[PDB]
PDB file of C-alpha atoms and ligand atoms in Angstrom:
ATOM      1  CA  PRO A   1      30.294 -24.424  27.501  1.00  0.00           C
ATOM      2  CA  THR A   2      28.486 -27.538  26.290  1.00  0.00           C
ATOM      3  CA  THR A   3      28.081 -28.360  22.586  1.00  0.00           C
ATOM      4  CA  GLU A   4      24.559 -26.953  22.857  1.00  0.00           C
ATOM      5  CA  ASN A   5      25.901 -23.790  24.555  1.00  0.00           C
ATOM      6  CA  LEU A   6      28.417 -23.182  21.742  1.00  0.00           C
ATOM      7  CA  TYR A   7      25.540 -23.364  19.290  1.00  0.00           C
ATOM      8  CA  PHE A   8      23.614 -20.592  21.077  1.00  0.00           C
ATOM      9  CA  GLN A   9      25.393 -17.712  19.357  1.00  0.00           C
ATOM     10  CA  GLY A  10      24.374 -19.091  15.987  1.00  0.00           C
ATOM     11  CA  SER A  11      20.742 -18.910  17.083  1.00  0.00           C
ATOM     12  CA  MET A  12      21.090 -15.240  18.052  1.00  0.00           C
ATOM     13  CA  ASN A  13      20.947 -12.369  15.599  1.00  0.00           C
ATOM     14  CA  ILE A  14      19.503  -8.852  15.514  1.00  0.00           C
ATOM     15  CA  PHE A  15      15.960 -10.141  14.868  1.00  0.00           C
ATOM     16  CA  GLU A  16      16.000 -12.530  17.796  1.00  0.00           C
ATOM     17  CA  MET A  17      17.594  -9.829  19.997  1.00  0.00           C
ATOM     18  CA  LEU A  18      15.017  -7.167  19.335  1.00  0.00           C
ATOM     19  CA  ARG A  19      12.230  -9.753  19.517  1.00  0.00           C
ATOM     20  CA  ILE A  20      13.266 -10.429  23.173  1.00  0.00           C
ATOM     21  CA  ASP A  21      13.712  -6.742  24.085  1.00  0.00           C
ATOM     22  CA  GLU A  22      10.504  -5.530  22.421  1.00  0.00           C
ATOM     23  CA  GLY A  23       8.222  -8.570  22.709  1.00  0.00           C
ATOM     24  CA  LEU A  24       5.516  -9.407  20.206  1.00  0.00           C
ATOM     25  CA  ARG A  25       2.058  -7.914  20.494  1.00  0.00           C
ATOM     26  CA  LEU A  26      -0.656  -8.225  17.861  1.00  0.00           C
ATOM     27  CA  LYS A  27      -2.857  -5.481  19.357  1.00  0.00           C
ATOM     28  CA  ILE A  28      -2.071  -1.778  19.856  1.00  0.00           C
ATOM     29  CA  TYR A  29      -0.675  -1.204  23.359  1.00  0.00           C
ATOM     30  CA  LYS A  30       1.098   1.564  25.254  1.00  0.00           C
ATOM     31  CA  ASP A  31       4.807   0.992  25.808  1.00  0.00           C
ATOM     32  CA  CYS A  32       6.758   1.643  29.033  1.00  0.00           C
ATOM     33  CA  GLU A  33       6.617   5.369  28.247  1.00  0.00           C
ATOM     34  CA  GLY A  34       2.935   5.272  27.301  1.00  0.00           C
ATOM     35  CA  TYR A  35       3.438   5.562  23.523  1.00  0.00           C
ATOM     36  CA  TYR A  36       1.189   3.593  21.156  1.00  0.00           C
ATOM     37  CA  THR A  37       3.053   0.569  19.853  1.00  0.00           C
ATOM     38  CA  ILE A  38       2.346  -2.692  18.041  1.00  0.00           C
ATOM     39  CA  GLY A  39       4.073  -5.807  16.731  1.00  0.00           C
ATOM     40  CA  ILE A  40       7.762  -5.971  17.673  1.00  0.00           C
ATOM     41  CA  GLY A  41       8.514  -2.536  19.050  1.00  0.00           C
ATOM     42  CA  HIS A  42       6.824  -0.597  16.282  1.00  0.00           C
ATOM     43  CA  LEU A  43       6.091   2.884  17.626  1.00  0.00           C
ATOM     44  CA  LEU A  44       2.956   4.053  15.779  1.00  0.00           C
ATOM     45  CA  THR A  45       2.900   7.661  16.976  1.00  0.00           C
ATOM     46  CA  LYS A  46       3.781   9.671  20.082  1.00  0.00           C
ATOM     47  CA  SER A  47       0.216  11.035  20.105  1.00  0.00           C
ATOM     48  CA  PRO A  48      -2.103  10.276  23.074  1.00  0.00           C
ATOM     49  CA  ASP A  49      -4.950   9.850  20.586  1.00  0.00           C
ATOM     50  CA  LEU A  50      -5.684   6.161  19.971  1.00  0.00           C
ATOM     51  CA  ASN A  51      -7.317   7.023  16.639  1.00  0.00           C
ATOM     52  CA  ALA A  52      -4.094   8.632  15.482  1.00  0.00           C
ATOM     53  CA  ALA A  53      -2.330   5.342  16.288  1.00  0.00           C
ATOM     54  CA  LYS A  54      -4.898   3.301  14.377  1.00  0.00           C
ATOM     55  CA  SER A  55      -4.478   5.584  11.381  1.00  0.00           C
ATOM     56  CA  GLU A  56      -0.707   5.054  11.390  1.00  0.00           C
ATOM     57  CA  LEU A  57      -1.275   1.318  11.670  1.00  0.00           C
ATOM     58  CA  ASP A  58      -3.526   1.131   8.605  1.00  0.00           C
ATOM     59  CA  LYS A  59      -0.974   3.195   6.696  1.00  0.00           C
ATOM     60  CA  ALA A  60       1.867   0.923   7.852  1.00  0.00           C
ATOM     61  CA  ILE A  61       0.103  -2.387   7.105  1.00  0.00           C
ATOM     62  CA  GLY A  62      -1.953  -1.273   4.123  1.00  0.00           C
ATOM     63  CA  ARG A  63      -5.362  -2.578   5.184  1.00  0.00           C
ATOM     64  CA  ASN A  64      -8.150  -1.815   7.630  1.00  0.00           C
ATOM     65  CA  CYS A  65      -6.649  -3.272  10.812  1.00  0.00           C
ATOM     66  CA  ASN A  66      -8.761  -1.652  13.499  1.00  0.00           C
ATOM     67  CA  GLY A  67      -5.891  -1.983  15.928  1.00  0.00           C
ATOM     68  CA  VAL A  68      -5.003  -5.603  15.206  1.00  0.00           C
ATOM     69  CA  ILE A  69      -2.435  -7.390  13.039  1.00  0.00           C
ATOM     70  CA  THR A  70      -1.231 -10.908  12.245  1.00  0.00           C
ATOM     71  CA  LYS A  71       2.089 -12.514  13.184  1.00  0.00           C
ATOM     72  CA  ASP A  72       3.210 -12.380   9.550  1.00  0.00           C
ATOM     73  CA  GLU A  73       2.366  -8.652   9.351  1.00  0.00           C
ATOM     74  CA  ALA A  74       4.239  -7.946  12.574  1.00  0.00           C
ATOM     75  CA  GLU A  75       7.278  -9.750  11.140  1.00  0.00           C
ATOM     76  CA  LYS A  76       7.159  -7.820   7.868  1.00  0.00           C
ATOM     77  CA  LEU A  77       6.926  -4.500   9.689  1.00  0.00           C
ATOM     78  CA  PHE A  78       9.730  -5.580  12.037  1.00  0.00           C
ATOM     79  CA  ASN A  79      11.967  -6.454   9.115  1.00  0.00           C
ATOM     80  CA  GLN A  80      11.231  -2.985   7.642  1.00  0.00           C
ATOM     81  CA  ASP A  81      12.103  -1.273  10.929  1.00  0.00           C
ATOM     82  CA  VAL A  82      15.335  -3.276  11.306  1.00  0.00           C
ATOM     83  CA  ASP A  83      16.401  -2.339   7.776  1.00  0.00           C
ATOM     84  CA  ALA A  84      15.573   1.315   8.505  1.00  0.00           C
ATOM     85  CA  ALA A  85      17.841   1.226  11.584  1.00  0.00           C
ATOM     86  CA  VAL A  86      20.689  -0.361   9.627  1.00  0.00           C
ATOM     87  CA  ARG A  87      20.334   2.144   6.782  1.00  0.00           C
ATOM     88  CA  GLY A  88      20.202   4.946   9.360  1.00  0.00           C
ATOM     89  CA  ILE A  89      23.554   3.931  10.815  1.00  0.00           C
ATOM     90  CA  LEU A  90      25.330   3.328   7.516  1.00  0.00           C
ATOM     91  CA  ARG A  91      24.471   6.606   5.947  1.00  0.00           C
ATOM     92  CA  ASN A  92      25.448   8.597   9.024  1.00  0.00           C
ATOM     93  CA  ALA A  93      28.973  10.035   9.072  1.00  0.00           C
ATOM     94  CA  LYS A  94      29.245   9.832  12.841  1.00  0.00           C
ATOM     95  CA  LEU A  95      27.697   6.416  13.485  1.00  0.00           C
ATOM     96  CA  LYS A  96      29.141   4.481  10.532  1.00  0.00           C
ATOM     97  CA  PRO A  97      32.795   4.529  11.594  1.00  0.00           C
ATOM     98  CA  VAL A  98      31.904   3.553  15.117  1.00  0.00           C
ATOM     99  CA  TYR A  99      29.696   0.742  13.853  1.00  0.00           C
ATOM    100  CA  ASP A 100      32.379  -0.485  11.467  1.00  0.00           C
ATOM    101  CA  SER A 101      34.883  -0.643  14.402  1.00  0.00           C
ATOM    102  CA  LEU A 102      32.560  -2.976  16.359  1.00  0.00           C
ATOM    103  CA  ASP A 103      32.475  -6.780  16.368  1.00  0.00           C
ATOM    104  CA  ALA A 104      29.405  -8.618  15.093  1.00  0.00           C
ATOM    105  CA  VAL A 105      27.628  -8.881  18.421  1.00  0.00           C
ATOM    106  CA  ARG A 106      28.168  -5.234  19.348  1.00  0.00           C
ATOM    107  CA  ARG A 107      26.973  -4.280  15.842  1.00  0.00           C
ATOM    108  CA  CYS A 108      23.696  -5.965  16.815  1.00  0.00           C
ATOM    109  CA  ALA A 109      23.561  -3.912  19.997  1.00  0.00           C
ATOM    110  CA  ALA A 110      24.145  -0.795  17.842  1.00  0.00           C
ATOM    111  CA  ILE A 111      21.314  -1.650  15.468  1.00  0.00           C
ATOM    112  CA  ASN A 112      19.042  -2.339  18.486  1.00  0.00           C
ATOM    113  CA  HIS A 113      20.027   0.978  20.072  1.00  0.00           C
ATOM    114  CA  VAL A 114      19.179   2.881  16.896  1.00  0.00           C
ATOM    115  CA  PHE A 115      15.940   0.926  16.413  1.00  0.00           C
ATOM    116  CA  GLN A 116      14.932   2.002  19.916  1.00  0.00           C
ATOM    117  CA  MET A 117      16.164   5.636  20.012  1.00  0.00           C
ATOM    118  CA  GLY A 118      16.547   6.754  16.416  1.00  0.00           C
ATOM    119  CA  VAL A 119      19.645   8.049  14.724  1.00  0.00           C
ATOM    120  CA  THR A 120      19.877  11.552  16.081  1.00  0.00           C
ATOM    121  CA  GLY A 121      19.445  10.410  19.682  1.00  0.00           C
ATOM    122  CA  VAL A 122      22.240   7.892  19.340  1.00  0.00           C
ATOM    123  CA  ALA A 123      24.565  10.120  17.344  1.00  0.00           C
ATOM    124  CA  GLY A 124      24.148  12.717  20.082  1.00  0.00           C
ATOM    125  CA  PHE A 125      25.906  10.360  22.594  1.00  0.00           C
ATOM    126  CA  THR A 126      29.329  11.893  21.888  1.00  0.00           C
ATOM    127  CA  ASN A 127      31.173  10.294  24.780  1.00  0.00           C
ATOM    128  CA  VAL A 128      29.716   6.817  24.374  1.00  0.00           C
ATOM    129  CA  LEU A 129      30.589   6.810  20.680  1.00  0.00           C
ATOM    130  CA  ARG A 130      34.225   7.673  21.445  1.00  0.00           C
ATOM    131  CA  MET A 131      34.298   5.054  24.196  1.00  0.00           C
ATOM    132  CA  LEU A 132      33.026   2.348  21.875  1.00  0.00           C
ATOM    133  CA  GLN A 133      35.480   3.289  19.150  1.00  0.00           C
ATOM    134  CA  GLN A 134      38.282   3.112  21.731  1.00  0.00           C
ATOM    135  CA  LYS A 135      37.059  -0.281  23.089  1.00  0.00           C
ATOM    136  CA  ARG A 136      36.395   1.244  26.485  1.00  0.00           C
ATOM    137  CA  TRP A 137      33.506  -1.116  27.058  1.00  0.00           C
ATOM    138  CA  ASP A 138      33.022  -0.670  30.820  1.00  0.00           C
ATOM    139  CA  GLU A 139      32.965   3.067  30.489  1.00  0.00           C
ATOM    140  CA  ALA A 140      30.627   2.962  27.512  1.00  0.00           C
ATOM    141  CA  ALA A 141      28.196   0.814  29.486  1.00  0.00           C
ATOM    142  CA  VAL A 142      28.311   3.035  32.609  1.00  0.00           C
ATOM    143  CA  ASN A 143      27.619   6.045  30.406  1.00  0.00           C
ATOM    144  CA  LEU A 144      24.734   4.403  28.587  1.00  0.00           C
ATOM    145  CA  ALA A 145      23.272   3.627  31.962  1.00  0.00           C
ATOM    146  CA  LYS A 146      23.063   7.396  32.650  1.00  0.00           C
ATOM    147  CA  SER A 147      20.809   7.965  29.682  1.00  0.00           C
ATOM    148  CA  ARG A 148      17.132   8.745  29.768  1.00  0.00           C
ATOM    149  CA  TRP A 149      16.620   5.961  27.232  1.00  0.00           C
ATOM    150  CA  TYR A 150      17.789   3.392  29.757  1.00  0.00           C
ATOM    151  CA  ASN A 151      16.490   5.057  32.912  1.00  0.00           C
ATOM    152  CA  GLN A 152      12.918   5.696  31.789  1.00  0.00           C
ATOM    153  CA  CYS A 153      12.539   2.107  30.661  1.00  0.00           C
ATOM    154  CA  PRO A 154      15.256  -0.145  32.050  1.00  0.00           C
ATOM    155  CA  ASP A 155      13.911  -3.555  31.130  1.00  0.00           C
ATOM    156  CA  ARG A 156      13.857  -2.764  27.398  1.00  0.00           C
ATOM    157  CA  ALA A 157      17.412  -1.383  27.429  1.00  0.00           C
ATOM    158  CA  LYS A 158      19.325  -3.353  30.039  1.00  0.00           C
ATOM    159  CA  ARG A 159      20.300  -6.285  27.805  1.00  0.00           C
ATOM    160  CA  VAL A 160      21.544  -3.953  25.081  1.00  0.00           C
ATOM    161  CA  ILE A 161      23.841  -2.199  27.610  1.00  0.00           C
ATOM    162  CA  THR A 162      25.202  -5.533  28.858  1.00  0.00           C
ATOM    163  CA  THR A 163      25.828  -6.564  25.257  1.00  0.00           C
ATOM    164  CA  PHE A 164      27.773  -3.399  24.607  1.00  0.00           C
ATOM    165  CA  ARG A 165      29.854  -4.180  27.691  1.00  0.00           C
ATOM    166  CA  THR A 166      30.613  -7.827  26.870  1.00  0.00           C
ATOM    167  CA  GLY A 167      30.183  -8.453  23.141  1.00  0.00           C
ATOM    168  CA  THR A 168      28.499 -11.761  23.963  1.00  0.00           C
ATOM    169  CA  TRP A 169      24.882 -12.916  23.897  1.00  0.00           C
ATOM    170  CA  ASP A 170      24.809 -13.850  27.548  1.00  0.00           C
ATOM    171  CA  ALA A 171      22.121 -11.316  28.486  1.00  0.00           C
ATOM    172  CA  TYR A 172      19.682 -13.117  26.146  1.00  0.00           C
ATOM    173  CA  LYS A 173      20.149 -16.579  27.647  1.00  0.00           C
ATOM    174  CA  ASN A 174      17.828 -18.141  30.187  1.00  0.00           C
ATOM    175  CA  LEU A 175      14.766 -15.930  29.664  1.00  0.00           C
TER     176      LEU A 175
HETATM  177  N1  LIG B 201      28.549   0.166   3.842  1.00  0.00           N
HETATM  178  C1  LIG B 201      28.541  -0.700   4.589  1.00  0.00           C
HETATM  179  C2  LIG B 201      28.524  -1.794   5.510  1.00  0.00           C
HETATM  180  C3  LIG B 201      27.845  -2.974   5.206  1.00  0.00           C
HETATM  181  C4  LIG B 201      27.844  -4.013   6.135  1.00  0.00           C
HETATM  182  C5  LIG B 201      28.505  -3.867   7.352  1.00  0.00           C
HETATM  183  C6  LIG B 201      29.187  -2.697   7.648  1.00  0.00           C
HETATM  184  C7  LIG B 201      29.196  -1.659   6.726  1.00  0.00           C
HETATM  185  O1  LIG B 201      29.837  -0.495   6.996  1.00  0.00           O
HETATM  186  N1  LIG B 202      26.082   3.810  21.219  1.00  0.00           N
HETATM  187  C1  LIG B 202      26.125   3.595  20.099  1.00  0.00           C
HETATM  188  C2  LIG B 202      26.169   3.314  18.704  1.00  0.00           C
HETATM  189  C3  LIG B 202      27.315   3.525  17.970  1.00  0.00           C
HETATM  190  C4  LIG B 202      27.346   3.269  16.605  1.00  0.00           C
HETATM  191  C5  LIG B 202      26.210   2.811  15.950  1.00  0.00           C
HETATM  192  C6  LIG B 202      25.049   2.596  16.678  1.00  0.00           C
HETATM  193  C7  LIG B 202      25.039   2.848  18.056  1.00  0.00           C
HETATM  194  O1  LIG B 202      23.928   2.613  18.779  1.00  0.00           O
END
């Protein structure tokens, strides 16, 4: 690794990670599963009704958006969603001990996983959670790759799985 290469991990954090996996969109769009989304991975509603999604948006931002937000607003909502994922892990009796056992980079993969799936979906992964706690990284990754989360939308999940396997940021290099 070059000097520049050794600096790369200091440039990566949970915000940069999710920003690559989710992208940044200032207008309402349908995600890989057809759910209304905006900003950096913010799921507005699972409803097929666009007007339901616009309603959720105005509630989330606090102004009349008509389907459109600013970069600053996207960032504020993203920061809210990241904190919600972190709080969701820490208060959960099943996820917290697993999270605490993980190194810093895998803790980012855990927050990303919860951001994407929610707490009950992750805490339901009984085998993966045991694998991670036991540092069985290859097995954990093979088992995450069986999930609907990954298989319905592989491009959004693949880097998180690799990060669980390796504990490095290598999947986020060379976009
Ligand atoms: N509670 C708590 C906590 C805070 C930062 C990182 C890991 C934790 O379990
Ligand atoms: N898989 C997994 C996992 C374990 C602990 C906390 C968050 C997670 O996504």
